[PDB]
Design an enzyme around this catalytic site. Structure first.
Site, PDB file in Angstrom:
ATOM      1  N   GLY A   1      -0.981  -8.858   5.098  1.00  0.00           N
ATOM      2  CA  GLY A   1      -2.171  -8.125   4.850  1.00  0.00           C
ATOM      3  C   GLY A   1      -2.240  -6.954   5.781  1.00  0.00           C
ATOM      4  N   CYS A   2      -3.105  -7.042   6.765  1.00  0.00           N
ATOM      5  CA  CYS A   2      -3.284  -6.006   7.762  1.00  0.00           C
ATOM      6  C   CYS A   2      -4.272  -6.549   8.793  1.00  0.00           C
ATOM      7  CB  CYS A   2      -3.825  -4.718   7.099  1.00  0.00           C
ATOM      8  SG  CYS A   2      -3.830  -3.245   8.147  1.00  0.00           S
TER       9      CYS A   2
ATOM     10  N   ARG B   1       1.348 -13.187   9.283  1.00  0.00           N
ATOM     11  CA  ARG B   1       0.024 -12.853   8.864  1.00  0.00           C
ATOM     12  C   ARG B   1       0.091 -11.592   7.996  1.00  0.00           C
ATOM     13  NH1 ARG B   1      -4.763 -11.937  13.318  1.00  0.00           N
ATOM     14  NH2 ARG B   1      -6.457 -11.284  11.878  1.00  0.00           N
TER      15      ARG B   1
ATOM     16  N   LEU C   1      -7.327  -6.493   9.282  1.00  0.00           N
ATOM     17  CA  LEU C   1      -8.693  -6.419   8.799  1.00  0.00           C
ATOM     18  C   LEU C   1      -9.084  -7.728   8.165  1.00  0.00           C
ATOM     19  CD1 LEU C   1      -9.582  -3.484   9.384  1.00  0.00           C
ATOM     20  CD2 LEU C   1      -7.282  -3.441   8.351  1.00  0.00           C
ATOM     21  N   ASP C   2     -10.292  -8.167   8.436  1.00  0.00           N
ATOM     22  CA  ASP C   2     -10.835  -9.386   7.830  1.00  0.00           C
ATOM     23  C   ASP C   2     -11.498  -9.024   6.498  1.00  0.00           C
ATOM     24  OD1 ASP C   2     -11.629 -12.413   8.382  1.00  0.00           O
ATOM     25  OD2 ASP C   2     -13.532 -11.474   7.822  1.00  0.00           O
TER      26      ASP C   2
ATOM     27  N   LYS D   1       0.802  -1.166   0.000  1.00  0.00           N
ATOM     28  CA  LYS D   1       0.000   0.000   0.000  1.00  0.00           C
ATOM     29  C   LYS D   1       0.861   1.253   0.000  1.00  0.00           C
ATOM     30  CE  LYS D   1       0.828  -1.154   4.505  1.00  0.00           C
ATOM     31  NZ  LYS D   1      -0.268  -0.913   5.492  1.00  0.00           N
TER      32      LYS D   1
END
Length: 152
Positions: A121-122, A119, A124-125, A84
């Protein structure tokens, strides 16, 4: 002489390991997601902050979201998937997909077949790991690289 190594793969591309991300095998290179702006206030990047302190090494490459910044120390390459733009930017599948492409193709040039990431991504699901895991395998097709995900 007390060294419990967790060398436990062989199942699929991705293998999930519960434990410390820095306790990863020496043969395995390490990858994770960061911003192109590289402002690390949160995430596993803050751990790399103390461990390698290569924020400027990344920024001096000047990568954009969709590219991967790599740090070579010795033995392993550190993959900073630029997922990002800003630090508070949230990962997109396609951006992550691009960072995986960049990462996977780079491994070929170096002879890297073992990778470990946490993990990604971040927190957030919003991205569903079910799509992420598939996408990783979709990108990784025709490679010989293992994927070791540490869960945190």
């Amino acid at each position: 002489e007390a060294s419990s190594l967790n060398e436990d793969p062989e199942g699929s591309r991705i293998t999930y390991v519960k434990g410390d991300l820095f306790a990863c095998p020496k043969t395995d290179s390490l990858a994770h997601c960061i911003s192109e702006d590289c402002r690390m206030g949160a995430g596993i990047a803050v751990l790399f902050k103390k461990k390698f302190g290569g924020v400027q090494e990344l920024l001096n490459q000047q990568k954009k979201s969709g590219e991967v910044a790599v740090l070579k120390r010795d033995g392993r390459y550190i993959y900073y998937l630029i997922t990002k733009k800003r630090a508070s930017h949230k990962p997109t599948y396609e951006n992550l997909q691009k960072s995986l492409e960049a990462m996977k193709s780079h491994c070929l040039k170096n002879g890297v077949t073992d990778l470990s990431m946490p993990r990604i991504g971040c927190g957030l699901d919003r991205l569903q790991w079910e799509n992420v895991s598939a996408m990783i395998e979709e990108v990784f097709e025709a490679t010989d690289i293992k994927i070791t995900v540490y869960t945190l």
